[PDB]
């Protein structure tokens, strides 16, 4: 298992524009297009991202390509974030994958605001961090996914994904 496989499970794969859990236009493997409520605005963002007139549909290859870019960006975003970097540097490989997933879902800004959980993670207080992570809108809105990422942080294993 690895980050890509993990996010593919959490996000799924759709070849046509769809709305995410927040009702935002998305495509592929969790690639957010726009927070705007206009489909045309989304179709436009999509053609711009793919470099062709798509008409709201892409192929698997195109989806995988946005995916690669998106995971690379998340990683690089963590590494450039003064709050996130040190936490990421302190973790083992499995747990790093969990921090990446959260950033992919919520943006680095969102994650950087889990001040207290970050500190617990950094200090390697697994059970406490899990508890704190759960007192969040994140957990209440997407509880099954959240439980998976939280167990990952708690255990350091991929069991929640098996
Ligand atoms: Cl893009
Ligand atoms: Cl969920």
PDB file of N, CA and C in Angstrom, residues 1-85:
ATOM      1  N   UNK A   1       0.848  -1.175   0.000  1.00  0.00           N
ATOM      2  CA  UNK A   1       0.000   0.000   0.000  1.00  0.00           C
ATOM      3  C   UNK A   1       0.878   1.218   0.000  1.00  0.00           C
ATOM      4  N   UNK A   2       0.369   2.302  -0.531  1.00  0.00           N
ATOM      5  CA  UNK A   2       1.147   3.518  -0.523  1.00  0.00           C
ATOM      6  C   UNK A   2       0.170   4.654  -0.657  1.00  0.00           C
ATOM      7  N   UNK A   3       0.694   5.845  -0.657  1.00  0.00           N
ATOM      8  CA  UNK A   3      -0.156   7.021  -0.730  1.00  0.00           C
ATOM      9  C   UNK A   3      -1.148   7.024  -1.888  1.00  0.00           C
ATOM     10  N   UNK A   4      -0.641   6.667  -3.034  1.00  0.00           N
ATOM     11  CA  UNK A   4      -1.524   6.687  -4.178  1.00  0.00           C
ATOM     12  C   UNK A   4      -2.657   5.734  -4.028  1.00  0.00           C
ATOM     13  N   UNK A   5      -2.353   4.515  -3.634  1.00  0.00           N
ATOM     14  CA  UNK A   5      -3.405   3.529  -3.444  1.00  0.00           C
ATOM     15  C   UNK A   5      -4.339   3.948  -2.346  1.00  0.00           C
ATOM     16  N   UNK A   6      -3.802   4.572  -1.317  1.00  0.00           N
ATOM     17  CA  UNK A   6      -4.604   4.993  -0.202  1.00  0.00           C
ATOM     18  C   UNK A   6      -5.589   6.072  -0.617  1.00  0.00           C
ATOM     19  N   UNK A   7      -5.114   7.101  -1.291  1.00  0.00           N
ATOM     20  CA  UNK A   7      -6.020   8.157  -1.763  1.00  0.00           C
ATOM     21  C   UNK A   7      -6.992   7.654  -2.833  1.00  0.00           C
ATOM     22  N   UNK A   8      -6.576   6.661  -3.610  1.00  0.00           N
ATOM     23  CA  UNK A   8      -7.511   6.152  -4.614  1.00  0.00           C
ATOM     24  C   UNK A   8      -8.727   5.482  -3.980  1.00  0.00           C
ATOM     25  N   UNK A   9      -8.500   4.833  -2.851  1.00  0.00           N
ATOM     26  CA  UNK A   9      -9.534   4.225  -2.083  1.00  0.00           C
ATOM     27  C   UNK A   9     -10.440   5.302  -1.429  1.00  0.00           C
ATOM     28  N   UNK A  10      -9.858   6.334  -0.830  1.00  0.00           N
ATOM     29  CA  UNK A  10     -10.625   7.384  -0.168  1.00  0.00           C
ATOM     30  C   UNK A  10     -11.398   8.283  -1.094  1.00  0.00           C
ATOM     31  N   UNK A  11     -10.862   8.495  -2.264  1.00  0.00           N
ATOM     32  CA  UNK A  11     -11.467   9.433  -3.182  1.00  0.00           C
ATOM     33  C   UNK A  11     -12.296   8.814  -4.320  1.00  0.00           C
ATOM     34  N   UNK A  12     -11.959   7.613  -4.705  1.00  0.00           N
ATOM     35  CA  UNK A  12     -12.605   6.940  -5.833  1.00  0.00           C
ATOM     36  C   UNK A  12     -12.066   7.520  -7.147  1.00  0.00           C
ATOM     37  N   UNK A  13     -12.705   7.139  -8.236  1.00  0.00           N
ATOM     38  CA  UNK A  13     -12.318   7.642  -9.535  1.00  0.00           C
ATOM     39  C   UNK A  13     -13.582   7.851 -10.392  1.00  0.00           C
ATOM     40  N   UNK A  14     -13.808   9.075 -10.869  1.00  0.00           N
ATOM     41  CA  UNK A  14     -14.929   9.450 -11.733  1.00  0.00           C
ATOM     42  C   UNK A  14     -14.415  10.252 -12.874  1.00  0.00           C
ATOM     43  N   UNK A  15     -14.840   9.825 -14.070  1.00  0.00           N
ATOM     44  CA  UNK A  15     -14.480  10.417 -15.310  1.00  0.00           C
ATOM     45  C   UNK A  15     -15.359  11.568 -15.728  1.00  0.00           C
ATOM     46  N   UNK A  16     -16.437  11.838 -15.030  1.00  0.00           N
ATOM     47  CA  UNK A  16     -17.171  13.038 -15.398  1.00  0.00           C
ATOM     48  C   UNK A  16     -17.267  13.929 -14.226  1.00  0.00           C
ATOM     49  N   UNK A  17     -17.485  15.236 -14.500  1.00  0.00           N
ATOM     50  CA  UNK A  17     -17.598  16.170 -13.410  1.00  0.00           C
ATOM     51  C   UNK A  17     -18.641  15.679 -12.415  1.00  0.00           C
ATOM     52  N   UNK A  18     -18.335  15.765 -11.130  1.00  0.00           N
ATOM     53  CA  UNK A  18     -19.326  15.340 -10.140  1.00  0.00           C
ATOM     54  C   UNK A  18     -19.247  16.281  -8.996  1.00  0.00           C
ATOM     55  N   UNK A  19     -20.156  16.209  -8.038  1.00  0.00           N
ATOM     56  CA  UNK A  19     -20.016  17.080  -6.888  1.00  0.00           C
ATOM     57  C   UNK A  19     -19.451  16.310  -5.744  1.00  0.00           C
ATOM     58  N   UNK A  20     -18.530  16.946  -5.008  1.00  0.00           N
ATOM     59  CA  UNK A  20     -17.966  16.250  -3.907  1.00  0.00           C
ATOM     60  C   UNK A  20     -18.918  16.281  -2.681  1.00  0.00           C
ATOM     61  N   UNK A  21     -18.463  15.783  -1.524  1.00  0.00           N
ATOM     62  CA  UNK A  21     -19.277  15.723  -0.268  1.00  0.00           C
ATOM     63  C   UNK A  21     -19.742  17.087   0.193  1.00  0.00           C
ATOM     64  N   UNK A  22     -19.000  18.176  -0.198  1.00  0.00           N
ATOM     65  CA  UNK A  22     -19.349  19.599   0.135  1.00  0.00           C
ATOM     66  C   UNK A  22     -20.205  20.282  -0.934  1.00  0.00           C
ATOM     67  N   UNK A  23     -20.442  19.516  -2.030  1.00  0.00           N
ATOM     68  CA  UNK A  23     -21.222  19.910  -3.170  1.00  0.00           C
ATOM     69  C   UNK A  23     -20.414  20.691  -4.152  1.00  0.00           C
ATOM     70  N   UNK A  24     -19.110  20.480  -4.137  1.00  0.00           N
ATOM     71  CA  UNK A  24     -18.250  21.196  -5.110  1.00  0.00           C
ATOM     72  C   UNK A  24     -17.869  20.301  -6.262  1.00  0.00           C
ATOM     73  N   UNK A  25     -17.795  20.967  -7.416  1.00  0.00           N
ATOM     74  CA  UNK A  25     -17.439  20.342  -8.674  1.00  0.00           C
ATOM     75  C   UNK A  25     -16.003  19.863  -8.623  1.00  0.00           C
ATOM     76  N   UNK A  26     -15.920  18.582  -8.920  1.00  0.00           N
ATOM     77  CA  UNK A  26     -14.719  17.783  -8.859  1.00  0.00           C
ATOM     78  C   UNK A  26     -14.651  16.838 -10.020  1.00  0.00           C
ATOM     79  N   UNK A  27     -13.480  16.266 -10.243  1.00  0.00           N
ATOM     80  CA  UNK A  27     -13.374  15.258 -11.274  1.00  0.00           C
ATOM     81  C   UNK A  27     -12.208  14.357 -10.931  1.00  0.00           C
ATOM     82  N   UNK A  28     -12.200  13.197 -11.539  1.00  0.00           N
ATOM     83  CA  UNK A  28     -11.085  12.278 -11.440  1.00  0.00           C
ATOM     84  C   UNK A  28     -10.978  11.654 -10.086  1.00  0.00           C
ATOM     85  N   UNK A  29      -9.788  11.748  -9.557  1.00  0.00           N
ATOM     86  CA  UNK A  29      -9.513  11.214  -8.213  1.00  0.00           C
ATOM     87  C   UNK A  29      -9.477  12.363  -7.211  1.00  0.00           C
ATOM     88  N   UNK A  30     -10.664  12.930  -6.916  1.00  0.00           N
ATOM     89  CA  UNK A  30     -10.689  14.001  -5.926  1.00  0.00           C
ATOM     90  C   UNK A  30     -10.047  15.290  -6.366  1.00  0.00           C
ATOM     91  N   UNK A  31     -10.007  15.545  -7.665  1.00  0.00           N
ATOM     92  CA  UNK A  31      -9.424  16.798  -8.088  1.00  0.00           C
ATOM     93  C   UNK A  31     -10.477  17.906  -8.073  1.00  0.00           C
ATOM     94  N   UNK A  32     -10.420  18.794  -7.108  1.00  0.00           N
ATOM     95  CA  UNK A  32     -11.375  19.863  -7.034  1.00  0.00           C
ATOM     96  C   UNK A  32     -11.270  20.832  -8.201  1.00  0.00           C
ATOM     97  N   UNK A  33     -12.343  21.162  -8.803  1.00  0.00           N
ATOM     98  CA  UNK A  33     -12.235  22.091  -9.903  1.00  0.00           C
ATOM     99  C   UNK A  33     -12.457  23.514  -9.478  1.00  0.00           C
ATOM    100  N   UNK A  34     -13.547  23.747  -8.755  1.00  0.00           N
ATOM    101  CA  UNK A  34     -13.935  25.084  -8.341  1.00  0.00           C
ATOM    102  C   UNK A  34     -14.937  24.992  -7.219  1.00  0.00           C
ATOM    103  N   UNK A  35     -14.953  26.030  -6.400  1.00  0.00           N
ATOM    104  CA  UNK A  35     -15.933  26.136  -5.339  1.00  0.00           C
ATOM    105  C   UNK A  35     -17.169  26.920  -5.842  1.00  0.00           C
ATOM    106  N   UNK A  36     -17.074  27.438  -7.040  1.00  0.00           N
ATOM    107  CA  UNK A  36     -18.183  28.153  -7.678  1.00  0.00           C
ATOM    108  C   UNK A  36     -19.342  27.229  -8.053  1.00  0.00           C
ATOM    109  N   UNK A  37     -20.559  27.752  -7.995  1.00  0.00           N
ATOM    110  CA  UNK A  37     -21.742  26.928  -8.247  1.00  0.00           C
ATOM    111  C   UNK A  37     -22.238  26.856  -9.661  1.00  0.00           C
ATOM    112  N   UNK A  38     -21.328  27.196 -10.531  1.00  0.00           N
ATOM    113  CA  UNK A  38     -21.570  27.190 -11.938  1.00  0.00           C
ATOM    114  C   UNK A  38     -20.785  26.095 -12.644  1.00  0.00           C
ATOM    115  N   UNK A  39     -21.543  25.250 -13.325  1.00  0.00           N
ATOM    116  CA  UNK A  39     -21.028  24.113 -14.062  1.00  0.00           C
ATOM    117  C   UNK A  39     -20.129  24.539 -15.195  1.00  0.00           C
ATOM    118  N   UNK A  40     -20.490  25.637 -15.759  1.00  0.00           N
ATOM    119  CA  UNK A  40     -19.688  26.162 -16.830  1.00  0.00           C
ATOM    120  C   UNK A  40     -18.402  26.652 -16.257  1.00  0.00           C
ATOM    121  N   UNK A  41     -18.490  27.318 -15.112  1.00  0.00           N
ATOM    122  CA  UNK A  41     -17.239  27.715 -14.517  1.00  0.00           C
ATOM    123  C   UNK A  41     -16.359  26.441 -14.306  1.00  0.00           C
ATOM    124  N   UNK A  42     -16.946  25.340 -13.895  1.00  0.00           N
ATOM    125  CA  UNK A  42     -16.198  24.074 -13.705  1.00  0.00           C
ATOM    126  C   UNK A  42     -15.647  23.464 -14.997  1.00  0.00           C
ATOM    127  N   UNK A  43     -16.453  23.550 -16.059  1.00  0.00           N
ATOM    128  CA  UNK A  43     -16.046  23.013 -17.349  1.00  0.00           C
ATOM    129  C   UNK A  43     -14.883  23.814 -17.867  1.00  0.00           C
ATOM    130  N   UNK A  44     -14.880  25.063 -17.526  1.00  0.00           N
ATOM    131  CA  UNK A  44     -13.803  25.888 -17.981  1.00  0.00           C
ATOM    132  C   UNK A  44     -12.490  25.621 -17.268  1.00  0.00           C
ATOM    133  N   UNK A  45     -12.599  25.401 -15.981  1.00  0.00           N
ATOM    134  CA  UNK A  45     -11.468  25.080 -15.161  1.00  0.00           C
ATOM    135  C   UNK A  45     -10.984  23.750 -15.641  1.00  0.00           C
ATOM    136  N   UNK A  46     -11.905  22.858 -15.981  1.00  0.00           N
ATOM    137  CA  UNK A  46     -11.437  21.567 -16.432  1.00  0.00           C
ATOM    138  C   UNK A  46     -10.604  21.601 -17.752  1.00  0.00           C
ATOM    139  N   UNK A  47     -11.035  22.378 -18.739  1.00  0.00           N
ATOM    140  CA  UNK A  47     -10.348  22.419 -20.010  1.00  0.00           C
ATOM    141  C   UNK A  47      -9.018  23.043 -19.855  1.00  0.00           C
ATOM    142  N   UNK A  48      -8.992  24.009 -18.972  1.00  0.00           N
ATOM    143  CA  UNK A  48      -7.740  24.702 -18.646  1.00  0.00           C
ATOM    144  C   UNK A  48      -6.713  23.725 -17.985  1.00  0.00           C
ATOM    145  N   UNK A  49      -7.215  22.880 -17.093  1.00  0.00           N
ATOM    146  CA  UNK A  49      -6.345  21.916 -16.420  1.00  0.00           C
ATOM    147  C   UNK A  49      -5.816  20.811 -17.334  1.00  0.00           C
ATOM    148  N   UNK A  50      -6.658  20.365 -18.297  1.00  0.00           N
ATOM    149  CA  UNK A  50      -6.327  19.307 -19.244  1.00  0.00           C
ATOM    150  C   UNK A  50      -5.723  19.820 -20.524  1.00  0.00           C
ATOM    151  N   UNK A  51      -5.997  21.049 -20.862  1.00  0.00           N
ATOM    152  CA  UNK A  51      -5.405  21.575 -22.088  1.00  0.00           C
ATOM    153  C   UNK A  51      -6.145  21.131 -23.346  1.00  0.00           C
ATOM    154  N   UNK A  52      -7.448  20.923 -23.219  1.00  0.00           N
ATOM    155  CA  UNK A  52      -8.243  20.560 -24.366  1.00  0.00           C
ATOM    156  C   UNK A  52      -9.677  20.813 -24.057  1.00  0.00           C
ATOM    157  N   UNK A  53     -10.484  20.854 -25.110  1.00  0.00           N
ATOM    158  CA  UNK A  53     -11.901  21.073 -24.928  1.00  0.00           C
ATOM    159  C   UNK A  53     -12.472  19.768 -24.499  1.00  0.00           C
ATOM    160  N   UNK A  54     -12.771  19.623 -23.204  1.00  0.00           N
ATOM    161  CA  UNK A  54     -13.199  18.322 -22.690  1.00  0.00           C
ATOM    162  C   UNK A  54     -14.665  18.050 -22.728  1.00  0.00           C
ATOM    163  N   UNK A  55     -15.484  19.064 -22.555  1.00  0.00           N
ATOM    164  CA  UNK A  55     -16.907  18.822 -22.485  1.00  0.00           C
ATOM    165  C   UNK A  55     -17.291  18.065 -21.183  1.00  0.00           C
ATOM    166  N   UNK A  56     -16.485  18.219 -20.109  1.00  0.00           N
ATOM    167  CA  UNK A  56     -16.806  17.612 -18.776  1.00  0.00           C
ATOM    168  C   UNK A  56     -16.487  16.166 -18.575  1.00  0.00           C
ATOM    169  N   UNK A  57     -15.772  15.605 -19.547  1.00  0.00           N
ATOM    170  CA  UNK A  57     -15.374  14.222 -19.458  1.00  0.00           C
ATOM    171  C   UNK A  57     -13.878  14.064 -19.767  1.00  0.00           C
ATOM    172  N   UNK A  58     -13.156  13.211 -19.020  1.00  0.00           N
ATOM    173  CA  UNK A  58     -11.745  12.998 -19.289  1.00  0.00           C
ATOM    174  C   UNK A  58     -11.513  11.505 -19.334  1.00  0.00           C
ATOM    175  N   UNK A  59     -10.333  11.103 -19.705  1.00  0.00           N
ATOM    176  CA  UNK A  59     -10.053   9.706 -19.736  1.00  0.00           C
ATOM    177  C   UNK A  59      -9.299   9.370 -18.457  1.00  0.00           C
ATOM    178  N   UNK A  60      -9.146   8.086 -18.228  1.00  0.00           N
ATOM    179  CA  UNK A  60      -8.443   7.553 -17.096  1.00  0.00           C
ATOM    180  C   UNK A  60      -7.033   8.082 -16.972  1.00  0.00           C
ATOM    181  N   UNK A  61      -6.324   8.085 -18.083  1.00  0.00           N
ATOM    182  CA  UNK A  61      -4.994   8.628 -18.122  1.00  0.00           C
ATOM    183  C   UNK A  61      -4.909  10.083 -17.655  1.00  0.00           C
ATOM    184  N   UNK A  62      -5.848  10.910 -18.115  1.00  0.00           N
ATOM    185  CA  UNK A  62      -5.933  12.301 -17.742  1.00  0.00           C
ATOM    186  C   UNK A  62      -6.205  12.433 -16.212  1.00  0.00           C
ATOM    187  N   UNK A  63      -7.096  11.585 -15.721  1.00  0.00           N
ATOM    188  CA  UNK A  63      -7.409  11.607 -14.297  1.00  0.00           C
ATOM    189  C   UNK A  63      -6.155  11.280 -13.498  1.00  0.00           C
ATOM    190  N   UNK A  64      -5.394  10.285 -13.978  1.00  0.00           N
ATOM    191  CA  UNK A  64      -4.202   9.857 -13.291  1.00  0.00           C
ATOM    192  C   UNK A  64      -3.143  10.897 -13.355  1.00  0.00           C
ATOM    193  N   UNK A  65      -3.181  11.648 -14.382  1.00  0.00           N
ATOM    194  CA  UNK A  65      -2.226  12.709 -14.494  1.00  0.00           C
ATOM    195  C   UNK A  65      -2.533  13.843 -13.527  1.00  0.00           C
ATOM    196  N   UNK A  66      -3.806  14.236 -13.410  1.00  0.00           N
ATOM    197  CA  UNK A  66      -4.142  15.272 -12.419  1.00  0.00           C
ATOM    198  C   UNK A  66      -3.786  14.726 -11.051  1.00  0.00           C
ATOM    199  N   UNK A  67      -3.977  13.427 -10.893  1.00  0.00           N
ATOM    200  CA  UNK A  67      -3.693  12.833  -9.565  1.00  0.00           C
ATOM    201  C   UNK A  67      -2.263  12.937  -9.166  1.00  0.00           C
ATOM    202  N   UNK A  68      -1.378  12.508 -10.065  1.00  0.00           N
ATOM    203  CA  UNK A  68       0.073  12.633  -9.834  1.00  0.00           C
ATOM    204  C   UNK A  68       0.458  14.092  -9.469  1.00  0.00           C
ATOM    205  N   UNK A  69      -0.083  15.029 -10.234  1.00  0.00           N
ATOM    206  CA  UNK A  69       0.238  16.398  -9.951  1.00  0.00           C
ATOM    207  C   UNK A  69      -0.246  16.798  -8.565  1.00  0.00           C
ATOM    208  N   UNK A  70      -1.461  16.362  -8.204  1.00  0.00           N
ATOM    209  CA  UNK A  70      -2.053  16.722  -6.953  1.00  0.00           C
ATOM    210  C   UNK A  70      -1.319  16.125  -5.773  1.00  0.00           C
ATOM    211  N   UNK A  71      -0.784  14.911  -5.919  1.00  0.00           N
ATOM    212  CA  UNK A  71      -0.103  14.360  -4.774  1.00  0.00           C
ATOM    213  C   UNK A  71       1.244  15.022  -4.626  1.00  0.00           C
ATOM    214  N   UNK A  72       1.864  15.326  -5.756  1.00  0.00           N
ATOM    215  CA  UNK A  72       3.147  15.982  -5.724  1.00  0.00           C
ATOM    216  C   UNK A  72       3.009  17.348  -5.077  1.00  0.00           C
ATOM    217  N   UNK A  73       1.945  18.008  -5.404  1.00  0.00           N
ATOM    218  CA  UNK A  73       1.717  19.338  -4.825  1.00  0.00           C
ATOM    219  C   UNK A  73       1.510  19.314  -3.311  1.00  0.00           C
ATOM    220  N   UNK A  74       0.769  18.316  -2.859  1.00  0.00           N
ATOM    221  CA  UNK A  74       0.500  18.159  -1.449  1.00  0.00           C
ATOM    222  C   UNK A  74       1.806  17.950  -0.716  1.00  0.00           C
ATOM    223  N   UNK A  75       2.594  17.008  -1.226  1.00  0.00           N
ATOM    224  CA  UNK A  75       3.873  16.782  -0.573  1.00  0.00           C
ATOM    225  C   UNK A  75       4.651  18.082  -0.531  1.00  0.00           C
ATOM    226  N   UNK A  76       4.758  18.730  -1.679  1.00  0.00           N
ATOM    227  CA  UNK A  76       5.564  19.913  -1.693  1.00  0.00           C
ATOM    228  C   UNK A  76       4.980  21.006  -0.844  1.00  0.00           C
ATOM    229  N   UNK A  77       3.694  21.032  -0.746  1.00  0.00           N
ATOM    230  CA  UNK A  77       3.115  22.016   0.115  1.00  0.00           C
ATOM    231  C   UNK A  77       3.482  21.783   1.615  1.00  0.00           C
ATOM    232  N   UNK A  78       3.412  20.562   2.080  1.00  0.00           N
ATOM    233  CA  UNK A  78       3.806  20.199   3.438  1.00  0.00           C
ATOM    234  C   UNK A  78       5.238  20.662   3.719  1.00  0.00           C
ATOM    235  N   UNK A  79       6.115  20.337   2.744  1.00  0.00           N
ATOM    236  CA  UNK A  79       7.524  20.633   2.897  1.00  0.00           C
ATOM    237  C   UNK A  79       7.796  22.090   2.938  1.00  0.00           C
ATOM    238  N   UNK A  80       6.902  22.897   2.394  1.00  0.00           N
ATOM    239  CA  UNK A  80       7.172  24.323   2.453  1.00  0.00           C
ATOM    240  C   UNK A  80       6.421  25.010   3.591  1.00  0.00           C
ATOM    241  N   UNK A  81       5.630  24.253   4.328  1.00  0.00           N
ATOM    242  CA  UNK A  81       4.855  24.870   5.353  1.00  0.00           C
ATOM    243  C   UNK A  81       5.595  24.788   6.669  1.00  0.00           C
ATOM    244  N   UNK A  82       5.865  25.935   7.280  1.00  0.00           N
ATOM    245  CA  UNK A  82       6.622  25.935   8.526  1.00  0.00           C
ATOM    246  C   UNK A  82       5.916  25.181   9.631  1.00  0.00           C
ATOM    247  N   UNK A  83       4.640  25.016   9.527  1.00  0.00           N
ATOM    248  CA  UNK A  83       4.005  24.298  10.589  1.00  0.00           C
ATOM    249  C   UNK A  83       3.962  22.804  10.325  1.00  0.00           C
ATOM    250  N   UNK A  84       3.868  22.467   9.074  1.00  0.00           N
ATOM    251  CA  UNK A  84       3.720  21.082   8.745  1.00  0.00           C
ATOM    252  C   UNK A  84       5.003  20.320   8.595  1.00  0.00           C
ATOM    253  N   UNK A  85       5.962  20.977   8.043  1.00  0.00           N
ATOM    254  CA  UNK A  85       7.214  20.313   7.792  1.00  0.00           C
ATOM    255  C   UNK A  85       7.815  19.519   8.948  1.00  0.00           C
TER     256      UNK A  85
END
